[PDB]
UniProtKB/Swiss-Prot annotation, chain A:
One of its GO terms (molecular function) is structural constituent of chromatin. The chain holds residues 24 to 126 of 126 of the full protein. It is found in: Nucleus; Chromosome. Core component of nucleosome. Nucleosomes wrap and compact DNA into chromatin, limiting DNA accessibility to the cellular machineries which require DNA as a template. Histones thereby play a central role in transcription regulation, DNA repair, DNA replication and chromosomal stability. DNA accessibility is regulated via a complex set of post-translational modifications of histones, also called histone code, and nucleosome remodeling. Monoubiquitination of Lys-98 by BRE1 gives a specific tag for epigenetic transcriptional activation and is also prerequisite for histone H3 'Lys-4' and 'Lys-79' methylation. This is Histone H2B 1.1. It comes from the Eukaryota. The nucleosome is a histone octamer containing two molecules each of H2A, H2B, H3 and H4 assembled in one H3-H4 heterotetramer and two H2A-H2B heterodimers. The octamer wraps approximately 147 bp of DNA. Belongs to the histone H2B family. The keyword DNA-binding applies. It comes from Xenopus laevis. Signal peptide: none annotated.
Curated annotation (Swiss-Prot), chain E:
The modification N6,N6-dimethyllysine is found at residue 17. Belongs to the histone H4 family. The modification N6-methyllysine is found at residues 9, 17. It comes from Xenopus laevis (African clawed frog). This is Histone H4. One of its GO terms (cellular component) is nucleus. The modification Phosphotyrosine is found at residues 48, 85. One of its GO terms (molecular function) is protein heterodimerization activity. It is found in: Nucleus; Chromosome. There is a cross-link at residue 28 (Glycyl lysine isopeptide (Lys-Gly) (interchain with G-Cter in UFM1)). The modification N6-butyryllysine is found at residues 2, 5, 9, 13, 28, 41, 74, 76, 88.
Amino acid sequence: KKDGKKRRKSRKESYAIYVYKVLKQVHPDTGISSKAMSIMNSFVNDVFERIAGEASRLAHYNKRSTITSREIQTAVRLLLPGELAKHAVSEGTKAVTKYTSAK
Amino acid sequence: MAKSAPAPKKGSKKAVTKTQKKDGKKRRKSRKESYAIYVYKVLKQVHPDTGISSKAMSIMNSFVNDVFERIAGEASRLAHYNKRSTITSREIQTAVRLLLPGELAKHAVSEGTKAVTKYTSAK
Amino acid sequence: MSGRGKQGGKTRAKAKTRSSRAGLQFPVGRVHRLLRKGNYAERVGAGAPVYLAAVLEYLTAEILELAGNAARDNKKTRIIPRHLQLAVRNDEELNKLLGRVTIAQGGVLPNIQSVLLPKKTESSKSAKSK
Amino acid sequence: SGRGKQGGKTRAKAKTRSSRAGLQFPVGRVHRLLRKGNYAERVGAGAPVYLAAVLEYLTAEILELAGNAARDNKKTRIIPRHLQLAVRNDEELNKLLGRVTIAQGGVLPNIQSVLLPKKTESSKSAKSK
Amino acid sequence: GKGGKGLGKGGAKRHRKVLRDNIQGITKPAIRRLARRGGVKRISGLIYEETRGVLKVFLENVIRDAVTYTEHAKRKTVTAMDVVYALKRQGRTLYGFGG
Amino acid sequence: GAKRHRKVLRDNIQGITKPAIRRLARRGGVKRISGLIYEETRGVLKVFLENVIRDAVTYTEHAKRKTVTAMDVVYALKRQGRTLY
Amino acid sequence: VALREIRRYQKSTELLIRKLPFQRLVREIAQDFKTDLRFQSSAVMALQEASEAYLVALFEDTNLCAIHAKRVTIMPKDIQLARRIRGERA
DNA sequence: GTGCCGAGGCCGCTCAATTGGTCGTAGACAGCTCTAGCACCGCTTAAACGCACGTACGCGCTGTCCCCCGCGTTTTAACCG
DNA sequence: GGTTAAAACGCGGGGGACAGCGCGTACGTGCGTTTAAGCGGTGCTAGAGCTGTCTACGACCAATTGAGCGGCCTCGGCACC
C-alpha cells in the first residue's frame, strides 16, 4: 500500500488545470507558461479569500449561520465594481438555475 | 384521462356551437412563434430590475428572424461553394467571422465553442 | 441494444431539453427545425443549431443589456424602441452590423453639427452688429 | 419498474456537481474550503455553485485580455507581461488590483508632457498619447 | 393600514420636496472650516467646486457599501451598524456610533 | 541628387506613387488633384483590400486550402456588393 | 485672521458643515439608488464626522503639497496630486 | 559626419520524445447533514404626538488672484575619480 | 575615454503682499414630517430520522505536457558614399 513511494501526495489546493481548462475554452489555440500559472493560482486564492472574507462578516452580523448565494451576491457587489458585478451575478444566477433543473 | 386517436383530431376546434359551460374555442390562429418568452429570459439575467414593452419586443422578434436568415443564408451559400451537403458548427463559425464584426465574432465564437462543448461532452 | 425491449430507466435527460444540455436558453430545437424548414441544406448537423442559438443568445444579451443601460439614463424602466436606437448608434460594432436597419416607432441620436452654433457672441466681422 | 427509494442503475458519481450545471471549476473543493475555513459554522449548497461561477468569469476575462495582449506581442504563450498589461489597461481591473504586485510583470509606458522635447507639449502623432 | 416602499397615507397627511442640486449645501464657510482644520492659510476659489465634487465621490462610494449592507437584511432603515461595517471595508474607520 | 536602391520592406504600400493616382483620376474624370490625395488613397485602398481579404482568407481557410483561387475573391467581393464578372 | 481661526478649530472640536444640507445631500444620493430610503439620525451624523475628517486629511496633505512647490495656497492641481498618489482617484 | 537604412549572428521561443512515479475520474457500505414540514414570541411596520433644530432676511469684516519683480534653484555644456 | 550629476548663475514667468467687492452665514418662531415605541400574524431559519449517490480517501500504467537544444527570422548599433 504505502511501502512504495507515496510521501509526495499532498497539498493541491490550487486551480492550475481549472484555469488551463478555462483558458483553452475561452482561447482555442494558445499556450500558457508554468510561471504564469503561479500568478493566476495565487490571484484566484486571494479572490476566493476576499469574497469569502466579506461573506463571513455578513453572516455574523445578520445572526445567520448558513452561507447562501444571497450573501455571496452581496459580497460580489461589495467587492467588484458595477460593470464587473453585472456580469458576475448573471453567471452566478445562471449556475443556480441550471443546477436545480439538472439531476 | 383519455386515449386519443390520430384520425379525426386534426384541427379539432369549434365548428358548431355544441358546447357546455365554457364556449367553443375559436378557429386556430397561424402560429407566429416568437422568441419573446426567450428574449425576456435573457433580459432578466442581465437587468433583472428593468421591464420591456411589446413594441420593442416586436423589433427583437423581427431582429432575430432577420438575423437568422442572414447567418443561415450565408452558411447555405458556403455549403454549395465547398460542395458540402451538411451544415454544422464549423461552417456557421466561419459565417459568423464573415457577417459579424471583428470583436463581435470573437465573442460569439468563444461562447459558441463553449456551449457546443458542454452539449457534446455531456450525455 | 437490440430486441425492441424496454431499455429501462432514462439515464439521458428527459425533463431537460437540448438547450438545457448546453446551458443555453434559446430553443435549439426550433433552430434545428428552422434550418430544415428554410431549406438551407440537404442535411443539418447536430452542432449547427446549438452554435446558432448561443450566438443568438449572446447577441440578445448584449443588445438588451446596452438597451437597458440607455433606459436607466432616460429614467424609464420599460425598454422603449428609442432606447435600442441610442445603443445601436453609440456602439461602433453594433452600428456596423445594423447600419441599414430601421427601428419603428421612434429612435434618433441627438447629433448636432458644429456649424449650427455660430458662437461668435453674435459679433459680426469688424463690428459687433451685422 | 419498482426500485424502492432509489434505483441501483448507478451508485458511483453519476455526473458531478461540477459540470452538472455546465461548470468547469470544482465545487467540492470550494464547498470543503468554505467549511474547513471557519468562515461560518454552517454552509449551504447554493453557496459553492454561485461562487464557482464567479471565479470562472474573473479567470476567463483576464485570460482573454491577456491572450489578446499576447497576440499583439506576436507570442502565443501567455507571459505575466501580458497579465500586467491587461490589469493596468482597464480602470475596472485597476480598482480591484490596486496594491497588488505581479511577478515578472511590467509598467505601462506612461510619460508626462514635461519629460520630452519642447518645454511642455504633447502633440506627438499616432501610436502615442 | 398598509405600506410598501412608503408614503402609504397619501392625501394631505404627507409632503415631500424635490431634491436635485443640494450638493451646494457645503458653502464657503463650511468648506473653509475643514480647510482651516487642515491648517492651510489660503484656499483657492476653484477648489470649492472640487471639494464638493470630492465629497460627492467620497459619499457615493460609502453609500453603495452602506446601502448594499442594509439591503442584505432588507431593512428599510439604514442603521449606524451598517455604516461602520461599510467604513471598515473602505479603510476610513470611525470609532463609535455602535459597537 | 536623390536616389534609393532598397527594393522590399519599405515600398509595398507606397508603390502606387504619384502618377498612378493621376492615371486612376483620369479614368475617373478628374482634371486636377491635390497632393493630400496621395496619402488617403493608400489608406483608402488598404481599407478596401483589407475588408476583401479578410473574407477571402476566411473562405480559403474554411475550404482547407493554402492557395486563394480566383473564385474565392468573388465570394468576398459579392458580400460587399462589389461583384466581379 | 485665517491663521487666527486655525487655533479655534484646532483647539475646539465641532462639526464644521451644516447639519441638514448634509442630510439633504446624502438623501438625494440615496434616493437615486433606492427611493423612499429611511436614514437614521445617528447614521447621517456618523457619516458627517467621517466625511469631515476625510477632507481634513485631504486638506492636510494638500497643504504639504503646496509647500513642496514653493507655494502656500492650495489649488486644483494640489488636490489632483493627493488623490492620485493615494490611489483614491487613480 | 550624421541620423537612420541595412546585413551576419546569439540565445532562447514553439514544435516533439521516451521513462518514473504525481495527480483525477470510476466503485462499496458505515454516521451525518444536507433539505423538507410545523411553534410562539421577538425584530421591523404605519400613523399619530410632541419638540426643538432647520430655511428666508439682517450688519458686518474675510480673502484670491490681477500687476511689477528679486535672488536662490536645477538644467545646459566638456572634463575628472 | 565617455556618461550623467553638479558646481557656478541664465531667464521670463508665477506666487505672496499691495487692493477692492459680492455673497454665504446663523439667532427668534410654528406646522406638520420622519426616527424611535407598543404588541401580534403568519412565514423562514435551524432540530433530527431513515438509507442511500457523491466527495475524500487511496493503486497502477502507458501515455501526456512543460523543461531544454539547434538552425533559422528579428535588433541595435559603427563605418564609408
